[PDB]
Amino acid sequence: GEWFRDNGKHALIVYDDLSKQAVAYRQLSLLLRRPPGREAYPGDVFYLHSRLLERAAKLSEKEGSGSLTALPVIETQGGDVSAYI
Amino acid sequence: QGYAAEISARRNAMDNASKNAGDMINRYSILYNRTRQAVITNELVDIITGASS
Amino acid sequence: TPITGKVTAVIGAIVDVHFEQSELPAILNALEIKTPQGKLVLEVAQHLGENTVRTIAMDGTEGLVRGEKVLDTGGPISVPVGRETLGRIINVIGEPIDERGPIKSKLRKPIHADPPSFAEQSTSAEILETGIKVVDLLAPYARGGKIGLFGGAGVGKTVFIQELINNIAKAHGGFSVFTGVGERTREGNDLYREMKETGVINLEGESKVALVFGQMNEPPGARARVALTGLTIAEYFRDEEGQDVLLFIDNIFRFTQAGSEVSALLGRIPSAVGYQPTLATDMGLLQERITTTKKGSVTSVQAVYVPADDLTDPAPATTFAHLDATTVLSRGISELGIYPAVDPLDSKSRLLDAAVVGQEHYDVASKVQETLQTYKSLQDIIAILGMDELSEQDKLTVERARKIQRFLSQPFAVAEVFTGIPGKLVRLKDTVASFKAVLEGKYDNIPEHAFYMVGGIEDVVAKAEKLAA
Amino acid sequence: STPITGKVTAVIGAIVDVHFEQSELPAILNALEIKTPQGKLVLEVAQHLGENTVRTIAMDGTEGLVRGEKVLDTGGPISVPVGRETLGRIINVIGEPIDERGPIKSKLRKPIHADPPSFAEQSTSAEILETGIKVVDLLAPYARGGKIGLFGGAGVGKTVFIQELINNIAKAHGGFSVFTGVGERTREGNDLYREMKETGVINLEGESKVALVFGQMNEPPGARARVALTGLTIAEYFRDEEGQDVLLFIDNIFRFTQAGSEVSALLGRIPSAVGYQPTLATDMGLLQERITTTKKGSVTSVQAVYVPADDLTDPAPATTFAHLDATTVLSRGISELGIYPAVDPLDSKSRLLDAAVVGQEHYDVASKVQETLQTYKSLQDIIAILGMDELSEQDKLTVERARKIQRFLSQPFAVAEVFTGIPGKLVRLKDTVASFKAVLEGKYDNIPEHAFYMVGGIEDVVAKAEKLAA
Amino acid sequence: PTNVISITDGQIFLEAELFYKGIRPAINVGLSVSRVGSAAQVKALKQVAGSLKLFLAQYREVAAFAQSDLDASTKQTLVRGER
């Protein structure tokens, strides 16, 4: 995506689905035997996703308008929107 | 004759409704109670799992 | 190599060995402790170091004397495969449980195998029709597809599967695999008898079905690697014999369930609503070792026991991901007496479309889905009030939906005995026609009881005559 | 380079354990710097594990760290820079200008673990803030030095509300304001920066009557906790050292909670209810206690709060609900009705929302408003099943007034010139009290409902009545 | 219960409401199932007992929609069913 941005190109990135990343990080963390996070997802998922999502942007005119757009996708596994992810 | 029948019917209908509502209350009460217990159990397990580590 | 060891621990059926020589047999290598019951096959799952591996033990671990010698047979357990396995019921250690004596096999192959690559995919679009009305209308099959049911507590889970075997496997000339993971001894006996009776097991001849059957009494570890064995037999047909196959797997909840048990013992933080933290990966590998290669195309049926009917539990949830069509069966719809017990608002297929199964099919289905959703919406209103207390226009819809609901029960042929009613199998083309008419309200002149438990539209008419008498 | 040199022993995410040499030990809440080609990583010392091995939390990213990497010790609790040259620039958590308005020309530096004032220091509130926003003014008047709290859904014009508040109140106020944004979008940040340069409050050809400390979400959780603390210390410098009153603004304090919950887990603390930190109460408490009206100044915090899935029964919102003094609930439903204010009027409560203190007339008017709306809500159920027509004449007049009042609470905003385009309207407090009294009396029941809808004050309501009329 | 049900053949659910309501014992027939148990049926008792499950799931249905109007045929089923 950054290659598009660097070029000043307008592009769009679909991240489908972040939910399976969370499962991966759960597996990973618990088999690095790091204490179970909230709802069995290590508490640094927020950092993981937040950093990821802010790397899609409509950059400055100095940056040649690198307009990467993001569309995250979370598939509600019960319609439970109060779930951590 | 009509009005009396109509208003009486309205009374009758609204009575039978009250009964039906009671049954649904009871059904949702069991659901509520079970649901409450399940949430407690699921929460407890998470805490325990954390504590165990 | 004679890799001797001792059994340091026997914590459940997750024996730990300490190999004496410093040589380490790799993960998924196999060891035999020659038990006074024969032998016990164990499979390396961790190396915990100091030459102390930690091994899953397939069969039971009772009687073991701590500090008991082991010898390493190496590699993944090698099952016996061949065209001469057709009509053999095999344990998991590769030994015939139908006791037809030593399995004639040319090649014996390791249970472990890797799922075929993304580049080796060849992806279906084939039509396959089951002649079951609800199935045909709502979720068409495809030859290679992976269809899955999400039934309750064996609530005719088996019955549904049996119907599929009866129709589809006599319409598929290519081989077929029945793998029954952790399913009751009685069920196995019924199948063995039934298959022999319907000659699918030709005993004089050679069959065209092969079987692996794993009883639910079997210790958890054996049940876990029942799947891998079946996948190996399937691969042999799919790949190495090329030939199109079929596959049935039931109960694949047991695969998950077994994993959760061993996971705790292995020394994992068993979190994931108690399920093994490797649940997604294990399911993934299993369900991609079921795949449609450039070679063989294996129509697969996987049966999930929704645990306590909690579909929201992660284990059913992640199964939906690794399927292409699903046919969730609900206890409620069973209670309504509808056989088949398939949910009509909880089925999906990637084979349903206006361009796949045609616009007319799609249009008919669209209206049915919408109608049923309306009826479901007004289930509340009907109960709270009355059906005359909701709109006349709606009341026609509701009555139509009540008819549709009843119409959908098509008597089962395999359970024709059990139901008592003679089974009904209705053509797909016929099904579309029948529902089309009902949507145009043609037969909304004839009883709801006529619609209940009958086959095609013609049958409804005939049962109207029966009722009329 | 301090002879307090420590070597990293374990990088396990944010948890970074350091092995300071024999005898040499820092202290809890101190600051370690590790020199890197990625500036100086700041580690806040949070435990001693003894044997000259401390366990510290990282602020900056931990990628590439070499296990055994030399660690200098700053020796004291993270000290930001404060001044009046902190005004008018975006200062990141590690006290570095990220808007590149050149190096901060610090007067003093202070630790960010400054202690909250004592009981003696606190000077009892009585000042009345007025925002010129009708719902706020009438139904939950604000007080200078307050702890306003924008409980609401996810950015439900939450940012928009803050923007309006800054647009009116901040500019009106001569004092400084401190706008601190914890974990808000860096897109949104650029808009805010541009926008507040536009409102000129940030004047880059002059000074600024506001400072900014924007910490955004892409920063490790540990840093996210101390964005708030960093901003807070600047406000204390204004309150104390410059003496000036301010209006603090923080966004969003659920991010402060969320961040703290996360590093608690990493710190190994047993997670409390809904995974929240056991130290949640005290962390919130320290933040709130630090913010107060003293005999040195007055600080009016407006803290955005994101209420997950609009559940205030969620412990994190509920704990904050106690800790704040001037609550506001921003309901999605009211937004959807098209009313902006999106406030739930019955659920607005404020420390100052008295009787005599808000004025007897104000009180009575507000009592009448509350009853009218409460009745309207109660009758909504009756209308739902039985129908509108089965209500009494008295009720019908009440319903008609309530619908009119409902749309008279609507007041256009300047920050809905980017929405509707319609220029904002802000009505002074005295004027609102008078105008609402009239409505209730039914002096403006001869005015159509839609002639209250999305228009300001009484003059506007009357004018829009004329406009609709012809 | 579900774990047991999957293992077993049939269920013999008993309804508490019915237990109170004079069927003592009260064999709920909505939730009493038999999987393959009908190989037991002695032929006399298979013949006479023919379709009685269907009939009493017509009594269940009939009495489902009894609670208003019923055709004489349905009423006959209800009368037979109750009896």
UniProtKB/Swiss-Prot annotation, chain A:
Subcellular localization is given as:
Mitochondrion inner membrane
* Superkingdom of the organism of origin: Eukaryota
Q: How the protein is affected by changing G1D?
A: In ATP1-2; growth-defect
Q: Which family does it belong to?
A: Belongs to the ATPase alpha/beta chains family.
What is its biological role?
Mitochondrial membrane ATP synthase (F(1)F(0) ATP synthase or Complex V) produces ATP from ADP in the presence of a proton gradient across the membrane which is generated by electron transport complexes of the respiratory chain. F-type ATPases consist of two structural domains, F(1) - containing the extramembraneous catalytic core, and F(0) - containing the membrane proton channel, linked together by a central stalk and a peripheral stalk. During catalysis, ATP synthesis in the catalytic domain of F(1) is coupled via a rotary mechanism of the central stalk subunits to proton translocation.
- How does this chain assemble? F-type ATPases have 2 components, CF(1) - the catalytic core - and CF(0) - the membrane proton channel. CF(1) has five subunits: alpha(3), beta(3), gamma(1), delta(1), epsilon(1). CF(0) has three main subunits: a, b and c.
Q: Anything else the record notes?
A: Present with 41500 molecules/cell in log phase SD medium.
User: What's the protein here called?
Assistant: ATP synthase subunit alpha, mitochondrial
* The organism's taxonomic lineage, starting at the top: Eukaryota, Fungi, Dikarya, Ascomycota, Saccharomycotina
Full protein stretch here: 291 to 375 of 545
Swiss-Prot record, chain B:
Task: Tell me which positions the record assigns to the signal sequence.
Answer: none
Summarizing the annotation, the consequence of altering T41A is:
In ATP3-5; dominant suppressor of the slow-growth phenotype of yme1 strains lacking mitochondrial DNA
* UniProt subcellular location: Mitochondrion; Mitochondrion inner membrane
Q: What else is known?
A: Present with 28100 molecules/cell in log phase SD medium.
Record-stated family: Belongs to the ATPase gamma chain family.
Q: How does it assemble?
A: F-type ATPases have 2 components, CF(1) - the catalytic core - and CF(0) - the membrane proton channel. CF(1) has five subunits: alpha(3), beta(3), gamma(1), delta(1), epsilon(1). CF(0) has three main subunits: a, b and c.
Q: What does this protein do?
A: Mitochondrial membrane ATP synthase (F(1)F(0) ATP synthase or Complex V) produces ATP from ADP in the presence of a proton gradient across the membrane which is generated by electron transport complexes of the respiratory chain. F-type ATPases consist of two structural domains, F(1) - containing the extramembraneous catalytic core, and F(0) - containing the membrane proton channel, linked together by a central stalk and a peripheral stalk. During catalysis, ATP synthesis in the catalytic domain of F(1) is coupled via a rotary mechanism of the central stalk subunits to proton translocation.
Q: Any idea what this protein is called?
A: ATP synthase subunit gamma, mitochondrial
Q: Which organism is it from?
A: Saccharomyces cerevisiae (strain ATCC 204508 / S288c)
The gene for this chain is ATP3
Q: Span within the entire protein? A: 257 to 309 of 311
Swiss-Prot record, chain D:
Species classification: Eukaryota, Fungi, Dikarya, Ascomycota, Saccharomycotina
Q: Where in the cell is it found?
A: Mitochondrion; Mitochondrion inner membrane
Name the family the entry cites: Belongs to the ATPase alpha/beta chains family.
Q: What else is known?
A: Present with 164000 molecules/cell in log phase SD medium.
On this chain, the residues bearing Phosphothreonine are T74, T199
Task: Tell me which residues bear Phosphoserine.
Answer: S335
Q: Which HAMAP family match?
A: ATP_synth_beta_bact
Q: What is this protein called?
A: ATP synthase subunit beta, mitochondrial
The record's EC number reads 7.1.2.2
**Catalytic activity line of the entry:** ATP + H2O + 4 H(+)(in) = ADP + phosphate + 5 H(+)(out)
Offer an example of a GO molecular function term for this protein.
proton-transporting ATP synthase activity, rotational mechanism
